[PDB]
Design an enzyme around this catalytic site. Sequence first.
Site, short mmCIF file in Angstrom:
data_model
loop_
_atom_site.label_atom_id
_atom_site.label_comp_id
_atom_site.label_asym_id
_atom_site.label_seq_id
_atom_site.Cartn_x
_atom_site.Cartn_y
_atom_site.Cartn_z
N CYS A 23 0.89 -1.04 -0.13
CA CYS A 23 -0.32 0.13 -0.45
C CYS A 23 0.59 1.07 0.15
O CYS A 23 0.70 2.30 -0.69
CB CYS A 23 -1.26 -0.05 1.05
SG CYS A 23 -0.30 -0.14 2.92
N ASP A 156 -6.74 5.89 -2.31
CA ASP A 156 -6.40 4.80 -1.70
C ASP A 156 -6.77 3.84 -2.50
O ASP A 156 -7.31 2.99 -3.43
CB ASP A 156 -7.95 4.61 -1.00
CG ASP A 156 -7.98 3.74 -0.09
OD1 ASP A 156 -6.78 2.23 -0.26
OD2 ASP A 156 -8.40 3.42 0.79
N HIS A 158 -6.26 0.34 -1.83
CA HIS A 158 -7.61 -0.61 -1.35
C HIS A 158 -9.36 -0.09 -1.36
O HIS A 158 -9.34 0.88 -1.79
CB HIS A 158 -7.36 -1.80 0.58
CG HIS A 158 -7.95 -0.98 1.06
ND1 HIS A 158 -8.03 0.58 1.48
CD2 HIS A 158 -8.90 -1.45 2.50
CE1 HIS A 158 -8.77 0.65 2.66
NE2 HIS A 158 -9.27 -0.49 2.51
N1 GVE Z 1 0.62 -0.67 5.64
C1 GVE Z 1 0.30 -1.65 4.97
C2 GVE Z 1 -0.87 -1.52 2.96
C3 GVE Z 1 -1.66 -1.85 3.97
C4 GVE Z 1 -2.58 -3.29 4.65
O1 GVE Z 1 -1.78 -4.17 4.32
O2 GVE Z 1 -3.05 -3.57 3.88
C5 GVE Z 1 -3.71 -5.43 4.60
#
Ligand code: GVE
Lengths: 232, 75
Positions: A23, A156, A158
């Site tokens: 991320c 974002d 995710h």
């Molecule tokens: N901090 C790592 C990126 C975010 C992640 O792994 O979401 C679970």
Amino acid sequence: MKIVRASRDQSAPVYGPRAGSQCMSNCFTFLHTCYLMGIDPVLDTTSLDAVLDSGARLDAIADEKVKRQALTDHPYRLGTEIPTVIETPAGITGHALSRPFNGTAETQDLGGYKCLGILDFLTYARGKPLPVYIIVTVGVHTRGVIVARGATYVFDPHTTDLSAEAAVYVCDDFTEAISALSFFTEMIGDFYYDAVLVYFTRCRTTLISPSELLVQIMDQYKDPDIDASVMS
Amino acid sequence: MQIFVKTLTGKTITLEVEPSDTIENVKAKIQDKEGIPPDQQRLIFAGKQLEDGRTLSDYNIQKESTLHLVLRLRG
Ligand SMILES: *NC[C@H](*)CC(=O)OC
Ligand SMILES: [Mg+2]
Ligand SMILES: [Mg+2]
């Protein structure tokens, strides 16, 4: 608020064994690309997919340095663990990070050590020459934030309830930006963030040392918020 | 001697320490008690982040002092 989506999120199996954990590198690559190209070209599905691809590569580079240095054996990253030279088809940037910014919903002054609440932080950022580029982590989830004159962009990598895929959330005001940082729900009481401003320069080539780069960026901006203590 | 360590989200940790303990050692004690890795800890006293190789006595931190613990977040 408007949304621009990639065709996948960072957990897609195509991104490797570290799919999910990259991320922060995806966020750096987002900011990098916008600095180089301007914001408009990055806001389409093709370009966002390219950000994810480049972010996976950057993460792989960061992961090897962590292992080699024994920086930690934790799978998630700190900003100082991300390479300060980033190279993609868009071009090459060098960056330097600001001093730490941390806080809850409301500003706390710890005997002169200011821990700005999230709104006050974005407001602080907006007082700098625009646009301002920010890496912001809430919980384990890192987002890229760009504070620009007419909008705040939150990238974002995710999934959210509004988007299955990685997306940029185009926010008319900080209230919308903070909502995006809050996973679009109410968590005033649990809110806590860790953020750095990212100060970019375009590089002609990648042949510059990390120490040379930091000094050059310090001289370019002359902004006391750049963290000099990073120097080694 | 007893010092207090308070986070931004309210939580207060009580620690038994000695003036001649390094900040690094204090961070180790916080990991021992709370499980927070030292590299994620920023300790703050008198408006300033404390440096790992210095001691409590360097900063004139005395019995019953309160330190603030600001946490880095791994993403
Ligand atoms: N901090 C790592 C990126 C975010 C992640 O792994 O979401 C679970
Ligand atoms: Mg494009
Ligand atoms: Mg002793």
